[PDB]
Design a protein around this nucleic acid. Sequence first.
RNA 1: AGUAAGGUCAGCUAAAUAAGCUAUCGGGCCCAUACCCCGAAAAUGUUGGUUAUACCCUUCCCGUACUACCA
RNA 2: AAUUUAUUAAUGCAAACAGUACCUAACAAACCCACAGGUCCUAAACUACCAAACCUGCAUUAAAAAUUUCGGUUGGGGCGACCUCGGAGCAGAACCCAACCUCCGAGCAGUACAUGCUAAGACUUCACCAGUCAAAGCGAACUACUAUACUCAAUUGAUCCAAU
RNA 3: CCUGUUUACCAAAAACAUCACCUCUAGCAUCACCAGUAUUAGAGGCACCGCCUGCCCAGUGACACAUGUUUAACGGCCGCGG
RNA 4: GCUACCUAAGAACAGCUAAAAGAGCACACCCGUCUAUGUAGCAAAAUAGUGGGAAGAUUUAUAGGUAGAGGCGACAAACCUACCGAGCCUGGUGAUAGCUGGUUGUCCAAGAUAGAAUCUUAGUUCAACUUUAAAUUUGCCCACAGAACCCUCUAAAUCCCCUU
Lengths: 164, 202, 85, 56
Amino acid sequence: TPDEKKDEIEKIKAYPYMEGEPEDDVYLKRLYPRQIYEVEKAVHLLKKFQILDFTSPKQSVYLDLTLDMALGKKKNVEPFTSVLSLPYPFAGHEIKVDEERENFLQTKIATLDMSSDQIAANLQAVINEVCRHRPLNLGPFVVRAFLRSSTSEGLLLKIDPLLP
Amino acid sequence: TVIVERWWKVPLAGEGRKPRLHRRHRVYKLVEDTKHRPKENLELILTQSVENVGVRGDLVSVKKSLGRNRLLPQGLAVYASPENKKLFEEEKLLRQEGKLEKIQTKAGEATVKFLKSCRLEVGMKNNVKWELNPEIVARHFFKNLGVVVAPHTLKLPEEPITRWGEYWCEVTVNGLDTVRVPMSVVNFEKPKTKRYKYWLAQ
Amino acid sequence: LGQIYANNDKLSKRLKKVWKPQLFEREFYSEILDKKFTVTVTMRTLDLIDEAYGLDFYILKTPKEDLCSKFGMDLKRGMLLRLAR
Amino acid sequence: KSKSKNILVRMVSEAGTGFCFNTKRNRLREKLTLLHYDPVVKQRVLFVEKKKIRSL
RNA sequence: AGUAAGGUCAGCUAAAUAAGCUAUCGGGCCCAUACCCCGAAAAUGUUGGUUAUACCCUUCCCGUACUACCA
RNA sequence: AAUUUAUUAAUGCAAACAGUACCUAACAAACCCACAGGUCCUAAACUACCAAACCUGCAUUAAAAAUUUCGGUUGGGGCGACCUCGGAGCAGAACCCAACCUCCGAGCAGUACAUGCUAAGACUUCACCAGUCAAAGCGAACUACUAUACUCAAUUGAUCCAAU
RNA sequence: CCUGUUUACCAAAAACAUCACCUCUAGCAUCACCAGUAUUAGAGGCACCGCCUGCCCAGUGACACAUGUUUAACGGCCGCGG
RNA sequence: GCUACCUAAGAACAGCUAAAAGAGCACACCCGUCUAUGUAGCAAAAUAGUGGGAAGAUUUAUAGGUAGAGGCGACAAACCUACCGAGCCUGGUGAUAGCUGGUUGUCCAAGAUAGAAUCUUAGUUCAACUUUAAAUUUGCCCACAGAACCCUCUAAAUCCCCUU
Ligand SMILES: [K+]
Ligand SMILES: [K+]
Ligand SMILES: [K+]
Ligand SMILES: [K+]
Ligand SMILES: [K+]
Ligand SMILES: [K+]
Ligand SMILES: [Mg+2]
Ligand SMILES: [Mg+2]
Ligand SMILES: [Mg+2]
Ligand SMILES: [Mg+2]
Ligand SMILES: [Mg+2]
Ligand SMILES: [Mg+2]
Ligand SMILES: [Mg+2]
Ligand SMILES: [Mg+2]
Ligand SMILES: [Mg+2]
Ligand SMILES: [Mg+2]
Ligand SMILES: [Mg+2]
Ligand SMILES: [Mg+2]
Ligand SMILES: [Mg+2]
Ligand SMILES: [Mg+2]
Ligand SMILES: [Mg+2]
Ligand SMILES: [Mg+2]
Ligand SMILES: [Mg+2]
Ligand SMILES: [Mg+2]
Ligand SMILES: [Mg+2]
Ligand SMILES: [Mg+2]
Ligand SMILES: [Mg+2]
Ligand SMILES: [Mg+2]
Ligand SMILES: [Mg+2]
Ligand SMILES: [Mg+2]
Ligand SMILES: [Mg+2]
Ligand SMILES: [Mg+2]
Ligand SMILES: [Mg+2]
Ligand SMILES: [Mg+2]
Ligand SMILES: [Mg+2]
Ligand SMILES: [Mg+2]
Ligand SMILES: [Mg+2]
Ligand SMILES: [Mg+2]
Ligand SMILES: [Mg+2]
Ligand SMILES: [Mg+2]
Ligand SMILES: [Mg+2]
Ligand SMILES: [Mg+2]
Ligand SMILES: [Mg+2]
Ligand SMILES: [Mg+2]
Ligand SMILES: [Mg+2]
Ligand SMILES: [Mg+2]
Ligand SMILES: [Mg+2]
Ligand SMILES: [Mg+2]
């Protein structure tokens, strides 16, 4: 277990996060941790940002997954590419891996105009697809999820219920 | 504090008798030096408004170095004694009953200080016709300034904006402090494009 | 002032060892005396004052055998005189 | 002292009684499986080598 | 007088499939010699014992080495 | 030489103490837009550096020291050799018996896996410690196996303590 | 080398010191060095002068760090056969 | 208050040569080369003669400084109050000594002893021997019979052993 790799995985787990909006109506993002968790609200918010930041209705939602693709044993696992077609493919897709191996993957999920239920179903298939490399229960495989559109910032999805 | 114990057992002395100490009882082994223990925070009640600690009447756990050197000597905070705790608890109860707080929570004061000295770049794209509404304006606070602003708290100048220029935005925090921030409507640029053009070159 | 065994082994030499507290210079304000004193204290003294919620409480509450300082007892007499009078 | 040909090993009963005995075997041969009398069960049972004790 | 240690191609060293180098022999090169080139030959001090042998032990022999002190 | 760093110095960490920095690499293939630039094919997430010495604690490397010892046999001591165990001669026939006396060896190996348990009576290296032989009995083996305390001469090390 | 010094009470010397030569360390102030400042100060070797002081950094120590450096530091400065 | 070195402030050094002198000859003065005497001496280091130095790194009076895990030293392991491989006094201290010496009235009796271990062979502990008391029963001396082959001395003898 390399010190640099293990510390980064320890640090990302230690990033604070909170549920719901704070009491203050106007507050800085620095003063409070992340708040937005629900995937259904995330898809609606990504469409909302399309209206506010005037752009094309159809956007590629390149989900970024901070997957713990290591620390199964003292010997870390190696990157691969498991290709599984999504139930609602956008108009088999390879699961790319980071060049720097910083345990974050950039994979397109669905177009922005696609319904949230279809997008959520596509997300669930990816969760099982990425974990297929190391389906062992000895070590956690998913740490954080950031669903971002082409012209929007990611949101810390509550992927913990969707892990099994 | 250095804590040590004797290597050799001291024979019992009994009731009302001092123990008999041989020269071998001077042998000590180090148990623990308290200076190496993890540091604990100090519980204090603030009397004034601090930049980051908080505001008057708030139970704040701060580092012992900060409290003993800055807050206590300068009167910014007092000990969280039961007497002091009850006093401030009654103070806030009366303030709630009298509706005279106007002091903002710990986060709210920092937001106001940031909002006093800040400028928002509302990047609007030239191709698609755009109308500025408080929902759109609050979006740019989250992106550019990194501020989460409720849409209802924003008060636009009520004049529709379709051209690039300078305007003003009134931001209200907790319904108590109203901050008028400058507004700069500039043509939108992609952050990956904008950072390359300006930050990388200069 | 005590003795130690080298490498914490009773079969090794018995050496002389002296443990000294880490002394710090701090300034304390006394509400009763309305004066600030520059007193050499340790980290333990700061904790006792913090637990007593002030220097004035610490001086009055701490018994003579625990203060272990002639200056501390002199401070106690000054505070007690003002309260008495 | 430099010579080393046999080792001392512990044979543990396969009956689960915990009875053990030490025997000598060549270092270069495989682990021993011997039929030895076990007092707890009062009959001969298989014994399997588990750990080496020392070098003889 | 004691004790250590060494004994290997002609020579000198390395390894114990006992090899390399020089020397040695034969051929080539050159009017000739040498250098050079090709090829060949050439040894475990000795005694006995070490499964059996060799590097080991040991018998004997040559040479080598250190010590032989204090009153 | 063994033991030690108490002392001194250097270094490292902790303690104590100031705070200060603020993380950027597009590029339109198509389209839009008078520009400037946009849409589509990612615009995420997420920080960093230095607090001076002094003092104290814990380590490390040195310096300079401290404490203590320097075995025995021996045709005086030193040097050489020797120090434990077994066989043979001296010691011819019960036992025993020395020499820096004469000779040869040992610090294992091999085969079993009941070299399991238990118990009369004995031997004993001139003490002790230690060592040795054992009928019966229990349990096995066995009605082929000079089978029942392996072959073998020595083939080895007490207590404390440590490992489990 | 010289004058000198030493075991008062068995050794006065060839021993020690010494001018000279050389190596090492130090960029500096209010109690030594020094009320001084590298042509200085301290730690050492050797011993005026004259001719000279050769070879060696593998080991030891010191120094310096990327290899390394240093003997006027400790020390060393070969065989066999024809 | 001796001596080693140092500090403050003093003193002494005729005559001759050269006149420059850690220069020469040579008093005072300092030192102590050689010989004799002395050896409980005049003297716990001297006397007599002969010698080294004697304007210099000289000699010397006075007061002061450095103290024993030290001082000081032109290193002689010098010198630090006559005896310094590290002073002296007191205390711990009645240090310890397997080593040496000594160990006090009368009388009688028994009484000479294989070994083993040991940083042990200058000693101890256990055996053996010796002594005292006690218990109860054989002890000693010994008739046959009996106790090994291998091997050169076919030994003197021993062990066992009733009787007596
Ligand atoms: K003799
Ligand atoms: K002389
Ligand atoms: K070197
Ligand atoms: K006299
Ligand atoms: K004096
Ligand atoms: K003795
Ligand atoms: Mg009692
Ligand atoms: Mg007592
Ligand atoms: Mg010490
Ligand atoms: Mg320190
Ligand atoms: Mg001691
Ligand atoms: Mg010894
Ligand atoms: Mg000796
Ligand atoms: Mg001897
Ligand atoms: Mg002899
Ligand atoms: Mg010897
Ligand atoms: Mg015999
Ligand atoms: Mg006998
Ligand atoms: Mg016996
Ligand atoms: Mg039987
Ligand atoms: Mg002179
Ligand atoms: Mg003399
Ligand atoms: Mg003299
Ligand atoms: Mg003399
Ligand atoms: Mg000399
Ligand atoms: Mg100089
Ligand atoms: Mg010399
Ligand atoms: Mg010269
Ligand atoms: Mg030279
Ligand atoms: Mg070198
Ligand atoms: Mg002077
Ligand atoms: Mg004159
Ligand atoms: Mg003169
Ligand atoms: Mg005089
Ligand atoms: Mg003199
Ligand atoms: Mg003269
Ligand atoms: Mg004194
Ligand atoms: Mg002198
Ligand atoms: Mg000398
Ligand atoms: Mg000498
Ligand atoms: Mg004296
Ligand atoms: Mg005595
Ligand atoms: Mg003794
Ligand atoms: Mg008699
Ligand atoms: Mg012994
Ligand atoms: Mg004896
Ligand atoms: Mg008899
Ligand atoms: Mg009889």
